[PDB]
Amino acid sequence: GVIDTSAVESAITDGQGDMKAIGGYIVGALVILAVAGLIYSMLRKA
Amino acid sequence: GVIDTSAVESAITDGQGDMKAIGGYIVGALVILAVAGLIYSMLRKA
Amino acid sequence: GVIDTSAVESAITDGQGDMKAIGGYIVGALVILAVAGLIYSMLRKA
Amino acid sequence: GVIDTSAVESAITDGQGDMKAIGGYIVGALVILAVAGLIYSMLRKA
Amino acid sequence: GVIDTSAVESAITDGQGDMKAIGGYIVGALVILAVAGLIYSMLRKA
Amino acid sequence: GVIDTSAVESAITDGQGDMKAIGGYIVGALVILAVAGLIYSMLRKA
Amino acid sequence: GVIDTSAVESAITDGQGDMKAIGGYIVGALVILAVAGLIYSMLRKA
Amino acid sequence: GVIDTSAVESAITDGQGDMKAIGGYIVGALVILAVAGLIYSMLRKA
Amino acid sequence: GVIDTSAVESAITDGQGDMKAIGGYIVGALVILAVAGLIYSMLRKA
Amino acid sequence: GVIDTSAVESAITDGQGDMKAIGGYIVGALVILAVAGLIYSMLRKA
Amino acid sequence: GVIDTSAVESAITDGQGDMKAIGGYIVGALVILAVAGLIYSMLRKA
Amino acid sequence: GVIDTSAVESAITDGQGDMKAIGGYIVGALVILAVAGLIYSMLRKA
Amino acid sequence: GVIDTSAVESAITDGQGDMKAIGGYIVGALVILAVAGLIYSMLRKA
Amino acid sequence: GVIDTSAVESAITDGQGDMKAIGGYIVGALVILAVAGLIYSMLRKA
Amino acid sequence: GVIDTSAVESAITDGQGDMKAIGGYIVGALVILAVAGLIYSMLRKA
Amino acid sequence: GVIDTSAVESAITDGQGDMKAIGGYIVGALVILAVAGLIYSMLRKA
Amino acid sequence: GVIDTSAVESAITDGQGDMKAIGGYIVGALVILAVAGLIYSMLRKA
Amino acid sequence: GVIDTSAVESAITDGQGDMKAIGGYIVGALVILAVAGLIYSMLRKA
Amino acid sequence: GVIDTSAVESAITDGQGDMKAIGGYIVGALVILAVAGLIYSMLRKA
Amino acid sequence: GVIDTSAVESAITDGQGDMKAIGGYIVGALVILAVAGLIYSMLRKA
Amino acid sequence: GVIDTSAVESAITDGQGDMKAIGGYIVGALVILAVAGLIYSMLRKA
Amino acid sequence: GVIDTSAVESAITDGQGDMKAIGGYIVGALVILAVAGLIYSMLRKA
Amino acid sequence: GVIDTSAVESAITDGQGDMKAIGGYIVGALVILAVAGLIYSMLRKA
Amino acid sequence: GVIDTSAVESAITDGQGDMKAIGGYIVGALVILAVAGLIYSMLRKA
Amino acid sequence: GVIDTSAVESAITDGQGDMKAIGGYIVGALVILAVAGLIYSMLRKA
Amino acid sequence: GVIDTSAVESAITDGQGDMKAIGGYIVGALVILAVAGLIYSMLRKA
Amino acid sequence: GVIDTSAVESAITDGQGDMKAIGGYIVGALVILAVAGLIYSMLRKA
Amino acid sequence: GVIDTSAVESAITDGQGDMKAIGGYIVGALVILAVAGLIYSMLRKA
Amino acid sequence: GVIDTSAVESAITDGQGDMKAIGGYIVGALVILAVAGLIYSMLRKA
Amino acid sequence: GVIDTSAVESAITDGQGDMKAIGGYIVGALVILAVAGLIYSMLRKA
Amino acid sequence: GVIDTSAVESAITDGQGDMKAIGGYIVGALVILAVAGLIYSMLRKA
Amino acid sequence: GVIDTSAVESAITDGQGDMKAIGGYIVGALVILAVAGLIYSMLRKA
Amino acid sequence: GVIDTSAVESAITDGQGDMKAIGGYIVGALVILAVAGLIYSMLRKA
Amino acid sequence: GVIDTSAVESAITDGQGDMKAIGGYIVGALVILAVAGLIYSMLRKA
Amino acid sequence: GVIDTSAVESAITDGQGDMKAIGGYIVGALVILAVAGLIYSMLRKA
């Protein structure tokens, strides 16, 4: 039904709305991994 | 009878009137299924 | 009946009309998944 | 009666005439389902 | 029947009401999977 | 129905038409990954 | 009836006639998926 | 859907748009590693 | 009547005679479905 | 029906006949991947 | 009728007689899928 | 679900919260490696 | 059913309850890997 | 009859009364399936 | 029937009773996989 | 006749008396189907 | 009839009696599938 | 008539006598379907 | 039927009888993959 | 079925019974890799 | 379908046709890495 | 089917038959890598 | 399952129990390398 | 995500911010090595 | 896709285009090291 | 399968059987490197 | 497929065919390094 | 997990705890080298 | 990335910019060594 | 596996067992270098 | 790829082409060192 | 991590703190060499 | 594979076969250095 | 591991234990050089 | 490998076997230097 389907987009908004958030928030943790990684290499080096 | 049959359309209106509603309302539940489904995949991912 | 069946195409239009929309709108969420996915790989990388 | 039965074929023509139409028109909606389906898979993929 | 169908929405509310809950509650477990997963990678790393 | 099925190829054209595009467009991002990757190695090197 | 059933094979010819076409035409889209897939792997590689 | 897929390129632009940035920005750190590395060698030397 | 019933077997022969044909002829279409189906899987695969 | 089923093997022959071909032909592309891969390693090496 | 039912087993023999054949013959195609599948993995590997 | 996803950030906080710690704590050990390394070189020297 | 679904959370508690445990307990083994790894490097060094 | 039909609701109460029970009780078994399922994934993981 | 349905729970008990067992017992095999897996990594390492 | 009809209820009691039994007893067999069904799924799973 | 219906339970006993057997016996084959499945994974692994 | 009705049981014996046979004999064909079905799954698997 | 079902176990024996064989025989190929894999690593090594 | 499921543990015993063996036996080969590896380093050294 | 599958080889030609190119073209960059690498060593040397 | 499955081993023979070959043949290339590698070290040396 | 997971820790104990051992035991060999290394330097020296 | 990636540069700033520091600070120690080295040579000399 | 892959060469041009530059530019620094090195030796000498 | 897995050890024997050989045989070449290395030092010396 | 795999050896020939060449050709450059190296030592000497 | 990660620091303490020890203990041997070295020079001298 | 790499030259300028300085500045100390050295010889002389 | 890992120590014994030997045996050659070196100095001297 | 590898020799020509030059050109500076060295000795002498 | 890196400077302080000490302390021994050296020359002289 | 590995020894023979040659041939040049060195000392002497 | 590292000190004791010995024992030979040197000077003298 | 390492001692025998020879043979030339040196002094003398 028309009205019914409108409500679909709605929750699907949240869907994408929650996803840009979660996935983006995971990167916060990969950077930490990454940087902590370049120091490991400065010490190995000098 | 003419009059009698008119009354048919009437309840059949409800019929369709109740159906667009119920079936449409079930989708409300399939979207929840669907979205809760894409998050499961963001986590699996990151 | 002829007239009656015409009305069929009508709601079936909505049907397809609602479907190109919903399914297309779901992709909006798969791209988010996808892109958030390539960054995960730039960090893993550098 | 002969004449009477001729009139049968007539409405039965419509019958088939309305059916090739409706059923064929439903496919219009299954293709949409199908294609929207292969994109879902390009994104999952890349 | 009108009254009868009203009662439909009701239990269907629970339906969606129980689903947002369960599915959402499962994620609680995927995050645990996910995080326990990034540590595995800090150790592999350093 | 014949006519009906013709319309199938049509949307399936888009299907492939959208796919060569999307998937091809994703590579645009893998090259960036790749090249940014060879520099990382020139620096590691010298 | 004999004559009547002959006409069956006829439309069933179309049936198979439309199916070898559609299904075969879908593959056109899976190859695109496939090939676009091996490049993704050349870049990942080098 | 056509319109829907257009929106794909969009976020994929960001994808590549964020990647040239991040990966390029990581090099900023590898050069520091590199140069700090040639001095270590001037001192070892003289 | 004896003679009358003999004529029964006759048309019933056609009956079975038309049925082995039609049903057998439908399979012609299920194989097409089936095979077109295994290719879909070779591509998914490689 | 006997005759009808014979025709099954036929198209199923093609099925396997097309599959040994496609899948075998995909390998043609994996070898290219593979070899181009060992050179990458001779250069990394010397 | 006794005699009549005997004739049942007969065609049902074919039934099973055609089925062990068809289904068994389909496997011929799944093995091809399978083996072509392990090579894909030797190349990925070396 | 909204509420459910909030709880995601939470554990992901720990994730990053545990990672800055572990990885940072590993460096404590690389410095020891490093310094113990420069003495080795003072003795080699004088 | 309401009551029935309550019992869901319960076992799902265990689920997460067993997972934080197992995954956390695996790390116990990655640290051993890690540390035994830094000694290998002190010896290589001196 | 009025009285007679009253007795209908009665057994239909049981009907629903037995169904919320059985179906709800089946879930007890799907959760077990589900949870036993997330552990399988913690081990695959670490 | 009331009595009849009681007997349902019974076998459904076994159902869950057999499932916690089987699935739990499969893990016994995934741990073996897992541990045998960390040794592979100690050797690769030293 | 009054007396005569009384005897009706009697056998109709058996009727319902035999039916709650038979139908209830058939379920005994559907549960077996059902449970044997969830195990099939634990194995498919692990 | 009373006596007649008793005989019902009888064959229905067989029914369930044959079903616990068949379905249970099928599992014998799913375990084989399952186990042969974990070895495939030990080899993939080491 | 008494004698006449005795003869009823007789042919009804055949009835059941032919039915246990036919229906039982059909299963012969469902097993073939079933088993040919588990192999399809061993190949899909390995 | 009793006799009929006995014949079930029979073909199901083959089923499992063919499966232990096929799946076991596939491993023959995974070992080859595996071993050819450890040599690749002796050469990479020395 | 109870009895049927008992037989599950049985083959699953083999499963784990074959796995501790295979995986353990692979290590036999990684040690060879490892040791042959430390000699390579004594020679490089002296 | 025969014709349909022919078209497969076609795009798969491109696939390999694009891959020999890309991968080969990446080497162009590894040689640059390599040579720029031997000069670094002539200077270190003299 | 028995006969059908025999044919399985057959192609699986090729499978392993082609794999010992390919993988073994790849080593031919790793030795070249390896040896060309020890000369690089004689020159570096003297 | 609770009990089942307890058994996890168990084998994971061995895991770590075997790892502290192996990795620690490898060092036994690196010291030999190391010391044999300082003598090489006393002789070079005097 | 845009916002998310901004935060990347941030920690990567620290990364480089910590590296110019550490590596630069190590030189402080190489100069000490160096100078203490030229005195050793004045004494050797006079 | 053809067009898409063309764009690959493009960025890969930059890749090599940036690499000949960087690596070549590093040498600028090794010469400085080198020459400053021969003077150190003229003074040591006279 | 039991028998099937026995055959595993077999090829894994070769695996280790080929590895002790290859790796051991490589040392033959490192000794040559080594000795040719001590002469270089006798000449440098006298 | 047999034919398909033959074509594997082919490109793998090139692989080794290109590798003996490249790696061998790199040595051409290490000798130059080496010899230019012994002159440096004749001058240092006299 | 929080608790789990605490245990990380612990073994990492040992790690550093064992390293300051080993590396420091190696110096004990470099001093011996060093001093035994200055006497060699007093004798060369007088 | 183009812009990113430009920034490389920059810090590499410093690199060479700091090196001509340091190494040149060390000579300041070798001259002192040298001259203080010729006086030692005038006194030895007269 | 316990037993499996025991066998590890074994070959690792050889490892160290072969290393004390080789490295120790190399010294045999450094002494020759050394002594032949002190005579060179007696002659230079007298 | 054949063509691609040809281009390898090319840049490797430069490699050697630049090396004979640089290294040879460094000698120009060692002779200056050398000769300026023999005069130092004529003066010391007379 | 910021805090973590601070701790770096700390131990690096010791590093330099131990080095100025050791190297400076070695000179104590070179002076002894030196002076004991000028007396040798007063006696040679008178 | 057995046969495949035999071919390993072969090229490894060349490896050692080329190495005894090259390294031995380099000595030819160190002797020249050496002898030309003793004459330098006869002239210095007389 | 704690225990494992203890064993390190042990062999390192030998290390220093063998070094004080060897180096000290070499001096035995430098004194001989030295004294035999002062006699050469008594004879030159008288 | 045991056997493999035995072969080590072998070539190392030559190593020492060639060294006692070469170095000893060089002395032959230092004596000539030495004696030719004492005559120079008899003539200077008388």
For residue G9, what is the domain's CATH number? 1.20.5.230
Chain AF neighbors (3+ CB pairs < 8 Å): A, L, X, AB
Distance from CA of AD22 to the nearest CA of AH (A): 16
How far is the alpha carbon of AG43 from chain Z, nearest alpha carbon, in Å?
Answer: 17
Q: Are residues Y8 and G43, on separate chains, in Cβ contact within 8 Å? A: yes
* E14 → closest Cβ in M2, M19, M33: M2
Q: Do chains S and T touch (3 or more CB pairs under 8 A)?
A: yes
Cross-chain residue pair AF1–A36, CB shorter than 8 Å: yes
Q: CA O11 to CA Z18: how far, in whole Å?
A: 56
Instruction: Find chains touching chain N: ≥3 CB pairs under 8 Å.
Output: E, M, O, P, W
Give the whole-angstrom CA distance, residue I16 versus residue I24.
Answer: 12
Measure the CA–CA gap between G25 and F16, rounded to whole angstroms: 10
Interchain proximity AB29–W38, CB inside 8 Å: yes
Distance CA E35, CA E24 (A): 17
The closest CB to that of T34, out of O26, O29, O46, belongs to: O46
Sign of the CA dihedral with AA17 first, then AA18, AA21, and AA24 last: negative
Side-chain half-sphere exposure of M24, counting CA atoms within 13 A: 16
For residue X3, the chain C residues in CB contact (below 8 A) are none
Place of tokens 């059908």: V4
Contact between F21 and G29 under an 8 Å Cβ cutoff? The reply is no
CA distance Z40 to Z45: 9
Burial of C14-25, coded b for 16+ CB within 10 Å and e otherwise, reads ebbebbbbbbbb
Where do the DSSP E strands lie in P1-46?
none
Q: What angle separates helix AC2-45 from helix H2-45, to the nearest 10 degrees?
A: 0
Chain T neighbors of Z16, CB-CB under 8 A: 28-29, 32
Distance in angstroms (rounded) separating the CA atoms of residues O25 and O32: 12
CA distances from B30 to A16, T34, AH19 (A): 16, 55, 79
> Burial, S3: exposed, middle or buried (Cβ in 10 Å; 0-12, 13-18, 19+)?
exposed
The alpha carbon of G25 is separated from its chain's Cα centroid by a whole number of angstroms, namely: 4
> DSSP letter string over T8-38?
HHHHHHHHHHHHHHHHHHHHHHHHHHHHHHH
Q: Which residue of B has its CA nearest to A25?
A: B46
Cα–Cα distance, C7 to AC28 (Å, whole number)? 99
Closest chain AA C-alpha to U5 CA, distance in angstroms: 17
> Which positions ≥6 away from AB40 have C-beta within 8 Å?
W45, W46, AH23, AH26, AH27, AH30
The residues, any chain, with a CB within 8 Å of residue AB8's CB and separated by 6 or more, are: E43, L22, L25, M27, M31
The shortest C-alpha distance from D20 to chain G (Å) reads 11
Asked if T4 contacts Q28 with a C-beta cutoff of 8 angstroms, the reply is yes
Give the residue from chain Q lying closest to O39, CA to CA. Q46
What is the dihedral sign for C-alpha C33, C35, C38, C44? negative
User: Is G30 part of the contact surface with chain F (CB cutoff 8 Å)?
Assistant: no
Answer for the pair Y23, U33: CB distance below 8 angstroms, yes or no. yes
d(CA A12, CA B35): 6
Resolution of the experimentally solved model in angstroms:
3.3
K42 exposure class (CB count in 10 Å sphere: 0-12, 13-18, 19+): buried
Q: What are phi and psi of AA24, to 5 degrees?
A: -65, -40
**Chain G CB contacts of J30 below 8 Å:** 38
The stretches of Q1-46 forming alpha helices (DSSP H) are 2-45
Q: Which of X7, X22, X27 sits opposite A28 (nearest CB)?
A: X7
Check contact E-R (3+ Cβ pairs < 8 Å). Answer: no
Q30 touches S at CB < 8 Å: no
Q: Is AD37 on the interface with AI (CB under 8 A)?
A: yes
Judging contacts by C-beta atoms under 8 Å, the chain S residues touching residue V21 are none
Show residues of chain E in contact with AB1, CB under 8 Å. 32, 36
Give the helix, strand, coil percentages of chain F, each rounded to 5.
Answer: 95, 0, 5
Cβ of residue D33 closer than 8 Å to a chain H Cβ = no
Structure tokens, AE32: 């200056």
- Cα distances from T43 to residues J14, W37, AD20, AG14, in angstroms, run 60, 11, 12, 20
Is there a contact between M2 and E25 if contact means CB atoms under 8 Å apart? no
List of residues 6+ apart from AG35 with CB closer than 8 A:
none
**U vs Y: CB pairs below 8 A:** 44
Contacting subunits of H (3+ beta carbon pairs below 8 A): A, C, D, F, X, Y, AC
Residue of V21, V29, V43 lying closest to AA30 (CB–CB):
V43
Contact Y33 H42 (CB under 8 A): yes
Contact (CB, 8 A) for V44 and U38: no
CA AD22 to each of CA O46, T40, AC6, AI8: distance values in angstroms, whole numbers, following the listed order? 20, 11, 52, 7
* Neighboring chain AE residues of U29 at a CB cutoff of 8 Å: none
Confirm or reject contact between L39 and chain A (CB < 8 A): no
Whether residue X22 contacts residue A43, with contact meaning beta carbons closer than 8 Å, is answered with yes
CA distance AD8 to L22: 31
Other beta carbons less than 10 A from residue W2's beta carbon? 10
| T34 part of contact set with chain W, CB < 8 Å | yes
The distance from CA X40 to its chain's CA centroid, rounded to whole angstroms, is: 25
AF33 lies within 8 A of chain L by CB:
no
Picking from S41, AA12, F42, Y15, the residue whose alpha carbon sits closest to that of residue J38 is AA12
Chain T residue numbers touching O32 (CB-CB < 8 A) = 16, 19-20, 23
Residue A23 tokens, joined = 């996935």
The domain tally of chain U equals 1
Measured between CA atoms, the residue of chain G closest to residue U22 is: G42
Phi, psi angles (nearest 5°) of residue E15 = -45, -55
Element at AH14 (helix H, strand E): helix AH2-45
Domain region containing Q24: 1-46
Question: Is E16 touching M (CB cutoff 8 A)?
Answer: no
Q: How far apart are CA G17 and CA G20, in angstroms?
A: 6
- Cβ P35 vs Cβ O22: under 8 Å: no
Hunting for tokens 């007539």 — which residue is that? D10
Give W13's contacts (C-beta < 8 A, 6+ positions apart).
none
What single letter denotes the amino acid at residue K36? A
Sign of the alpha-carbon torsion through D25, D27, D33, D38: negative
